[PDB]
Amino acid sequence: ALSEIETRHSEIIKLENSIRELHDMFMDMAMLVESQGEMIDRIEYNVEHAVDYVERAVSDTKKAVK
Amino acid sequence: NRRLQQTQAQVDEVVDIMRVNVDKVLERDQKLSELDDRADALQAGASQFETSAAKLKRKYW
Amino acid sequence: MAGRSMQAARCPTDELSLSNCAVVSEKDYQSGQHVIVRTSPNHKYIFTLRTHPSVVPGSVAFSLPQRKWAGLSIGQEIEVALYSFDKAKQCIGTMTIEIDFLQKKNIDSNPYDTDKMAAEFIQQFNNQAFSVGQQLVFSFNDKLFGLLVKDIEAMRQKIEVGLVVGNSQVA
Amino acid sequence: MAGRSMQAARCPTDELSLSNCAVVSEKDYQSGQHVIVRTSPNHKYIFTLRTHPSVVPGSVAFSLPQRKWAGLSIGQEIEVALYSFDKAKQCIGTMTIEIDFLQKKNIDSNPYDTDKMAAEFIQQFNNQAFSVGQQLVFSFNDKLFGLLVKDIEAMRQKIEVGLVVGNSQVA
Amino acid sequence: AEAMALLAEAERKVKNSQSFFSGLFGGSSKIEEACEIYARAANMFKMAKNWSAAGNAFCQAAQLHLQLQSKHDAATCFVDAGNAFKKADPQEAINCLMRAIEIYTDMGRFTIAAKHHISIAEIYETELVDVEKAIAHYEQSADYYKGEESNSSANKCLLKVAGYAAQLEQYQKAIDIYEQVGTSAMDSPLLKYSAKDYFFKAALCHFCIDMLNAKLAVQKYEELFPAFSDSRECKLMKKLLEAHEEQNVDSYTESVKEYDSISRLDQWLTTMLLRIKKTIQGDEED
Amino acid sequence: AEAMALLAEAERKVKNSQSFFSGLFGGSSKIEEACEIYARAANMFKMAKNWSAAGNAFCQAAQLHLQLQSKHDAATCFVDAGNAFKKADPQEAINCLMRAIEIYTDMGRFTIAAKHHISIAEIYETELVDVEKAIAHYEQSADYYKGEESNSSANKCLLKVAGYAAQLEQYQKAIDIYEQVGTSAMDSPLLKYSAKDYFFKAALCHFCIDMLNAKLAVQKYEELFPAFSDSRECKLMKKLLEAHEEQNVDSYTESVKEYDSISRLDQWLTTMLLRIKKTIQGDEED
């Protein structure tokens, strides 16, 4: 029936693009996961290094009393 | 026709999820940002302290 | 008689599962006494006890039908307490029952003499507790059926729970 | 021959359960010998022994079909004694068997060539003992059936118990 | 290494030294030791799953910490205490948190003040069930987040505020919140996708408005047929607005029946849609 | 530059000083020096792909580090040792982790303790094949995560627990876990979705219940036709319940035969489906 194959059309087009919008999110999100994935590249960097500077700080201070 | 409307809401079901996921990336934006800057200014005040400590070393060692 | 905690279990054999009796241990109760199983603040059911070696001390076993009528669950702790009827007012004299093949996997078009059913019914379900809406299984010629109490009359007042005796007519 | 008391156990695997043979230990009997189980003065049954590295010394394992025939239970006392048939008037030459699907949920409409069944039946149940009214299971093309010895004849002479040989015809 | 043992030594340590004990010096050096003790106790208390003991233990170490002058790490201890009582059996779950924020607030730490401010409003609702006090917090908290330019969290909280404000009859005061968080969401081409629901909520929330507050909010919204995300916002709304302007509680209840297929209604929507269905029924047969 | 050389210098100095050697002060720095040495050694061992040696070397540096006064950096070393032995060829990978957590646990650090606790159980299953101890760890660890109100991870662990607990035999102990992780999943409408599968698993797990434990668990479930997702949860379950209540080992095997089309049957489900498939046959001939 035309009322079926037709309703199907407007429904499928309202099914694919319904994924479009969703697809757009995976686009932006993915672009953000990598974007914010940069800060972590610095976090890991800073953290360990911050421990290096502090470690040298706790050492000198201890030897400054001995 | 059933399998059609059947797949519909199912897809939208994932769309509703991405929504929450998007709200999750925003949280990961506030944290990283401010924190990365704070922890970054840490090495600044930490390095200086290591410097002054060097003086305490050449006068107390 | 006041009350005691118990644990639901599964019916030992098949015979006891066709007697609609709460199979219990010989170290707790005795075959013949009645009890009122308490599950929730709004769920009071009455069953007939029948001891059996298999039963474990401190646990009562029920059949599939019963367990699907009282809403029990093996593992849950129920509160069982003795119960006594008022025969001089609760005895059953005329009770209508709804029968139908329990398993539609063994349905036939053969006729079954009811006159020989009511005779065997009282022959096996004598001196036992029955309630309106209660579900159970009937074994006629080793054939399983699905009974369902609809109306119960004494020897005339209509009651909810009664006690089937010898001179008890059934339809 | 003195007869020793044994304990009824459960058949090891499903392979020996399809042979209808009283599985025993090699530390007691040997594959090929015949025995007569005694449960009471008016109950004598004959089975065929078939050793297996999974039998407990001092006990004989029986399959469900056998227990539903000889009326045996897992964990009962029984007396077993060696039995020597008379290959002079007890040899089976023609034995009728009632075959039907064992599992009611595995019944089909496919054709089963009998000529192929008789040949495979004697090639698996050879040199074994079969009594009238005996129940067992037949494994034909990986399919379970429920045989039932209706009548046995010697190499026409009717006998209650015989010994299937290599040249034994079955219907 | 026993809990009670530590608690005891800790007690004998925590006390302004005087007379023979004080000798020549003292002060912070002792009270600090006690703090570490109680913390070490609270540790094994959370071990044996005492919680109550662990929580109160942290309360001890914390309060003592303040007696030394160290609000920072103290407040953090207050947090360990709050988390303890929360996931425990006694109360205090609310007190510890208030005692933590009073510190983070004055110390000039709003970033966190709001972090636990929301946890607070979350417990004062899911536990104490005090929506009127929860909203006050969800709100003031969003104010702080907005100050840190953390628009995101600011919105998270606002969404909570309005969301429960509607259940608390505060419909108009809810739509205002949706209007703000709705206008402060279009700026980001990443919230355009979410900006819908805001308009749907605001268009559903009715302070018993007689005019076209909704017929106007639906118009303020920009939709086109080619939308598929929109099909879950105004398309339905318009059909509900006509079903309200015509006292037809059959077109509204049938439309909610159809719409309840392509997109399920959460508890919130149901409660409000029901409230609107009632504004229609209570107006028809009457 | 030579490992065997440093390993030598590291020993002749890692000895409690006393008498003339002690001189004036102790040797809290000596032990630390030795630690740096072994670290440098284990360091080049990992370069020579001699992993085993790197690991044992790290074990040395770690143990010595404790002989100083630094449980933190020590435990981390225990982790380095485990990483080595793990990617290496010998064992010890399990010991290093037990010791690591031992420290993170006595120190008061449960977050990280659980972080390595799950790693442990994950090794004790896919490697040592010790499901009986693995579950113990997945569980205790999930308890720690639950102690940190970190529902997210707590569930990750619980799923593992119940999942393998069902494979073993623990069906009731499994359903209980699914009930907990199910009730503690609805509070957050961000897990509403997954909540199905939990009910599907719990309803599939049968502790030999001849009743409607599952018919009742499926009735407790909130499906509603308009919602589609549920189609991959209870829909099948109902049909399976019928195929179980009628001792029909064909309808059940046909139902799973069809369901495997609309929804892929993972290993787990299969193993259990077959187990139920056996309960039916084990009821037909009983």
Side-chain angles (χ1 to χ4, degrees), chain A, chain B residues 1-42 44-61, chain C, chain D, chain E, chain F residues 1-214 216-286:
Chain A
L2 292 301
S3 61
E4 296 183 357
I5 302 178
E6 182 178 60
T7 298
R8 165 182 286 294
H9 174 61
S10 179
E11 183 65 13
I12 295 182
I13 302 300
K14 186 174 297 178
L15 172 57
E16 176 197 299
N17 297 300
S18 295
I19 303 179
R20 250 66 153 57
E21 218 72 63
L22 180 60
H23 180 297
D24 287 65
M25 292 184 262
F26 277 61
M27 290 289 268
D28 301 299
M29 179 57 89
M31 181 245 266
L32 297 179
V33 180
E34 182 182 59
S35 176
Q36 286 137 172
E38 303 177 62
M39 287 63 110
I40 301 181
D41 295 359
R42 292 191 295 295
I43 298 179
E44 179 190 303
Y45 189 66
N46 294 237
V47 178
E48 294 186 298
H49 281 301
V51 182
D52 180 60
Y53 301 118
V54 176
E55 186 178 62
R56 292 180 172 293
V58 63
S59 62
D60 299 359
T61 55
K62 290 176 59 59
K63 298 180 180 181
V65 181
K66 301 178 180 180
Chain B
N1 185 62
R2 286 294 301 184
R3 188 67 58 180
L4 184 59
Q5 300 178 3
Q6 208 78 229
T7 306
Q8 182 58 54
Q10 292 184 299
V11 179
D12 306 301
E13 193 68 3
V14 181
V15 180
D16 300 1
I17 307 173
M18 258 292 99
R19 176 192 300 295
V20 190
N21 296 181
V22 177
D23 297 303
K24 294 188 182 63
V25 67
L26 273 293
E27 305 175 61
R28 174 156 159 279
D29 176 295
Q30 302 176 178
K31 303 179 181 62
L32 302 180
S33 179
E34 187 66 3
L35 180 58
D36 188 299
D37 299 304
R38 291 184 175 183
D40 193 305
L42 184 64
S47 181
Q48 294 297 300
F49 175 52
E50 183 181 301
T51 303
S52 298
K55 299 182 178 298
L56 304 176
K57 180 184 64 180
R58 289 185 289 292
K59 188 181 181 301
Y60 290 111
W61 188 301
Chain C
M1 192 289 260
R4 59 182 300 180
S5 60
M6 299 299 269
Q7 183 177 300
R10 181 175 183 180
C11 180
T13 60
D14 301 300
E15 180 179 59
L16 299 177
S17 179
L18 303 177
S19 61
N20 190 184
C21 301
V23 187
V24 297
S25 180
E26 303 180 300
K27 304 178 183 301
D28 299 300
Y29 306 71
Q30 299 180 299
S31 300
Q33 298 182 300
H34 303 300
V35 297
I36 174 178
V37 182
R38 179 182 179 297
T39 62
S40 301
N42 249 58
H43 292 120
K44 296 297 182 300
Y45 302 68
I46 306 175
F47 294 67
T48 301
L49 303 178
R50 171 61 89 70
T51 60
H52 186 298
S54 63
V55 182
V56 180
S59 61
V60 184
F62 303 68
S63 61
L64 183 60
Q66 303 173 299
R67 295 184 280 76
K68 295 182 63 180
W69 170 61
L72 301 178
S73 178
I74 295 180
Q76 68 176 61
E77 185 178 60
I78 59 178
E79 301 180 61
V80 181
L82 300 178
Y83 180 63
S84 300
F85 295 63
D86 184 0
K87 300 179 180 179
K89 180 181 178 299
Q90 297 183 239
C91 290
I92 303 178
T94 301
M95 177 176 83
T96 302
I97 304 177
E98 180 180 300
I99 184 176
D100 179 60
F101 294 66
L102 179 62
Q103 302 178 301
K104 61 174 61 181
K105 317 302 297 182
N106 302 300
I107 298 180
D108 56 61
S109 182
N110 299 300
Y112 293 66
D113 183 298
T114 61
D115 299 301
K116 299 181 180 60
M117 299 179 91
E120 182 178 300
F121 181 61
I122 304 299
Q123 180 60 60
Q124 179 179 238
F125 300 71
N126 59 62
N127 184 60
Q128 294 181 57
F130 289 68
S131 300
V132 180
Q134 181 180 60
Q135 301 181 61
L136 64 172
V137 294
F138 192 8
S139 59
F140 187 57
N141 295 122
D142 199 299
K143 192 67 177 182
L144 302 179
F145 293 73
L147 300 178
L148 181 61
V149 181
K150 300 298 297 180
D151 182 297
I152 301 178
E153 299 180 59
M155 300 183 272
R156 301 179 182 178
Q157 177 187 120
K158 297 175 287 63
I159 58 179
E160 303 177 61
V161 58
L163 179 61
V164 181
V165 299
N167 53 239
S168 299
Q169 301 180 300
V170 183
Chain D
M1 59 177 274
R4 60 189 302 179
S5 300
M6 302 300 266
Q7 181 180 300
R10 184 177 182 179
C11 181
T13 61
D14 295 300
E15 181 178 59
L16 298 178
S17 180
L18 301 174
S19 61
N20 188 182
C21 301
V23 186
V24 298
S25 180
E26 303 181 300
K27 304 178 182 301
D28 299 300
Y29 307 71
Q30 298 181 60
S31 300
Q33 299 181 300
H34 300 300
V35 297
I36 176 179
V37 182
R38 179 180 179 297
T39 60
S40 62
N42 297 301
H43 287 122
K44 297 297 182 300
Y45 303 69
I46 305 175
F47 295 67
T48 301
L49 303 178
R50 184 59 181 296
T51 61
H52 188 302
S54 66
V55 182
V56 182
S59 62
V60 185
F62 300 69
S63 60
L64 182 59
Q66 300 180 300
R67 297 174 298 182
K68 299 177 62 180
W69 174 59
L72 303 177
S73 181
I74 301 179
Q76 66 173 61
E77 183 181 62
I78 58 177
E79 300 181 60
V80 182
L82 300 176
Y83 182 63
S84 59
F85 289 63
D86 184 1
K87 299 179 181 180
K89 295 180 181 301
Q90 269 185 53
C91 295
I92 301 178
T94 301
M95 179 178 85
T96 301
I97 303 177
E98 179 180 300
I99 183 176
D100 174 56
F101 298 67
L102 180 60
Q103 301 177 299
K104 299 181 179 181
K105 293 303 300 176
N106 293 118
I107 303 177
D108 57 61
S109 60
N110 300 300
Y112 295 67
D113 186 298
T114 58
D115 299 300
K116 303 178 180 179
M117 306 180 94
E120 181 180 299
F121 180 62
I122 303 299
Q123 189 62 60
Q124 179 176 58
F125 300 69
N126 58 61
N127 187 60
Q128 288 179 52
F130 288 66
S131 299
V132 184
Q134 181 178 60
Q135 300 180 60
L136 65 173
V137 294
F138 192 9
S139 181
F140 187 57
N141 295 122
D142 299 300
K143 193 65 178 181
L144 303 178
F145 292 73
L147 301 179
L148 180 60
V149 182
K150 300 299 297 181
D151 182 296
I152 302 178
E153 301 180 59
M155 299 187 272
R156 296 181 177 181
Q157 183 176 300
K158 302 178 181 179
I159 59 178
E160 298 180 61
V161 60
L163 179 61
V164 182
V165 300
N167 57 241
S168 298
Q169 300 181 301
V170 182
Chain E
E2 183 66 302
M4 301 180 92
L6 299 179
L7 302 178
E9 299 182 301
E11 182 178 300
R12 300 182 178 181
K13 194 68 175 184
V14 51
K15 193 62 181 299
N16 299 57
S17 60
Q18 63 178 61
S19 183
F20 70 120
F21 204 76
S22 181
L24 300 177
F25 66 120
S28 297
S29 299
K30 300 181 179 59
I31 182 63
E32 187 171 60
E33 179 64 300
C35 298
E36 181 284 301
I37 299 300
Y38 285 122
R40 183 182 299 296
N43 155 53
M44 53 185 81
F45 275 130
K46 179 172 59 182
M47 173 71 91
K49 302 180 182 302
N50 292 60
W51 286 100
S52 301
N56 295 126
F58 283 122
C59 296
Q60 298 180 300
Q63 179 181 59
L64 302 192
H65 203 184
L66 298 177
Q67 300 181 304
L68 177 163
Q69 179 186 298
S70 300
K71 309 173 65 60
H72 277 299
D73 315 294
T76 72
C77 297
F78 287 62
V79 179
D80 296 62
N83 298 0
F85 292 115
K86 181 179 181 179
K87 177 51 186 176
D89 59 72
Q91 56 282 68
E92 302 296 295
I94 57 178
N95 181 298
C96 300
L97 296 179
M98 297 186 274
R99 288 295 307 300
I101 290 186
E102 65 174 60
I103 301 178
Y104 295 126
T105 303
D106 179 61
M107 185 57 85
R109 300 297 303 299
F110 291 114
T111 59
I112 171 60
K115 295 298 298 179
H116 283 54
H117 195 182
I118 63 178
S119 301
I120 283 184
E122 187 174 62
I123 304 177
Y124 283 46
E125 179 180 60
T126 62
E127 295 296 63
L128 299 178
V129 189
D130 195 306
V131 296
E132 59 184 2
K133 185 178 182 181
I135 301 177
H137 293 180
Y138 285 123
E139 183 177 301
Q140 182 177 60
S141 180
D143 288 59
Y144 298 123
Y145 283 122
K146 180 63 182 181
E148 310 303 63
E149 191 180 2
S150 59
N151 181 299
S152 179
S153 297
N155 298 10
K156 176 183 178 181
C157 303
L158 295 176
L159 295 176
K160 305 293 292 301
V161 183
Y164 303 124
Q167 297 295 59
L168 189 56
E169 187 281 302
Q170 302 181 60
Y171 301 118
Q172 61 174 59
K173 186 174 184 61
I175 63 178
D176 288 56
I177 300 178
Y178 289 121
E179 294 295 66
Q180 299 181 300
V181 65
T183 58
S184 60
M186 300 181 89
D187 184 299
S188 305
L190 302 177
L191 299 182
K192 179 182 64 183
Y193 291 54
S194 180
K196 315 174 305 179
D197 181 57
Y198 300 62
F199 282 112
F200 185 54
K201 291 183 173 298
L204 285 174
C205 304
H206 296 303
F207 56 112
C208 300
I209 179 63
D210 62 68
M211 292 184 267
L212 61 80
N213 182 297
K215 182 61 178 60
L216 178 60
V218 61
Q219 180 179 59
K220 299 179 64 59
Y221 177 62
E222 299 180 300
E223 177 189 59
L224 297 178
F225 301 124
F228 299 93
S229 298
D230 299 33
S231 304
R232 305 174 295 180
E233 194 288 298
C234 65
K235 183 59 187 63
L236 175 69
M237 184 54 68
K238 180 180 298 180
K239 181 61 180 59
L240 309 180
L241 305 180
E242 301 180 300
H244 186 183
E245 298 178 299
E246 299 179 300
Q247 72 171 61
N248 190 303
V249 72
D250 294 301
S251 300
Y252 178 65
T253 59
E254 184 176 301
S255 298
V256 68
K257 171 62 178 180
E258 299 181 59
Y259 182 69
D260 191 62
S261 300
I262 60 178
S263 300
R264 297 296 300 278
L265 302 171
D266 53 298
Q267 178 181 59
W268 192 79
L269 297 177
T270 302
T271 302
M272 182 170 274
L273 296 176
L274 230 60
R275 185 63 177 62
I276 303 177
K277 173 185 175 180
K278 300 177 62 60
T279 66
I280 302 177
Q281 298 179 299
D283 205 308
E284 290 180 294
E285 303 174 300
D286 200 307
Chain F
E2 298 179 299
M4 300 103 91
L6 300 177
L7 301 176
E9 301 181 302
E11 182 183 302
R12 50 177 39 177
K13 187 174 183 175
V14 60
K15 194 68 178 183
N16 295 61
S17 60
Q18 63 177 61
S19 299
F20 70 120
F21 196 69
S22 180
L24 183 166
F25 45 109
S28 297
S29 299
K30 301 178 177 59
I31 182 66
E32 184 174 61
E33 177 67 300
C35 297
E36 184 288 301
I37 299 300
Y38 284 126
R40 180 182 298 295
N43 189 300
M44 60 182 86
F45 281 125
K46 178 170 58 181
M47 173 60 242
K49 299 180 181 180
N50 291 359
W51 301 76
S52 301
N56 297 121
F58 278 124
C59 299
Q60 300 179 300
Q63 178 183 60
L64 306 189
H65 205 180
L66 298 177
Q67 300 182 301
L68 187 172
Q69 187 183 299
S70 305
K71 306 175 64 61
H72 282 295
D73 306 304
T76 69
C77 296
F78 289 64
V79 185
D80 297 301
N83 294 2
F85 290 119
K86 190 169 185 174
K87 177 59 181 58
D89 59 72
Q91 58 294 299
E92 299 299 64
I94 61 176
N95 181 299
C96 301
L97 297 178
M98 295 186 270
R99 293 292 302 300
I101 297 183
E102 145 183 290
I103 304 176
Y104 297 122
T105 299
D106 183 294
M107 180 58 90
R109 306 303 306 299
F110 291 115
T111 61
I112 184 63
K115 296 298 298 179
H116 291 59
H117 194 181
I118 59 177
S119 301
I120 284 183
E122 186 174 61
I123 304 174
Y124 285 46
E125 179 182 60
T126 59
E127 195 70 300
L128 296 177
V129 189
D130 196 307
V131 296
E132 56 183 59
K133 183 179 182 181
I135 301 178
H137 293 180
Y138 286 123
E139 181 180 300
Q140 182 177 59
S141 181
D143 296 301
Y144 293 122
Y145 287 119
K146 198 67 181 65
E148 301 299 301
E149 62 182 60
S150 61
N151 181 295
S152 300
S153 300
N155 293 53
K156 182 184 65 179
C157 303
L158 295 177
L159 297 176
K160 305 293 292 301
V161 183
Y164 305 123
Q167 295 296 62
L168 181 62
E169 192 288 301
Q170 306 177 61
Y171 294 120
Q172 64 174 61
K173 300 183 62 58
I175 65 178
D176 289 345
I177 297 177
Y178 287 122
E179 297 296 297
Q180 302 180 302
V181 68
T183 58
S184 61
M186 298 182 270
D187 183 297
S188 301
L190 303 180
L191 304 177
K192 176 183 62 181
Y193 301 62
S194 61
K196 313 178 304 176
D197 181 57
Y198 298 61
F199 281 109
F200 184 56
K201 292 183 173 298
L204 287 173
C205 303
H206 292 125
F207 58 114
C208 300
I209 178 64
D210 52 62
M211 286 189 244
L212 61 169
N213 185 299
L216 177 59
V218 65
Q219 182 178 59
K220 294 176 58 59
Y221 181 60
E222 303 176 300
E223 172 180 57
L224 300 177
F225 266 122
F228 280 92
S229 298
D230 311 306
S231 300
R232 301 182 298 295
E233 194 290 297
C234 60
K235 176 57 188 300
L236 175 68
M237 186 53 67
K238 179 181 297 180
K239 180 61 180 60
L240 307 180
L241 298 175
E242 302 181 301
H244 182 62
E245 297 177 300
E246 304 182 302
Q247 59 179 60
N248 187 302
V249 67
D250 297 60
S251 300
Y252 181 63
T253 64
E254 185 176 302
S255 298
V256 60
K257 173 63 181 302
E258 302 179 60
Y259 184 68
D260 185 58
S261 301
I262 60 179
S263 300
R264 183 64 64 186
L265 295 177
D266 57 298
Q267 180 184 356
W268 193 78
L269 297 178
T270 303
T271 302
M272 183 174 275
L273 297 175
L274 278 52
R275 186 64 178 64
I276 304 178
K277 175 184 176 180
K278 299 181 63 60
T279 63
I280 302 177
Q281 298 179 299
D283 182 297
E284 301 184 61
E285 204 70 299
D286 188 298

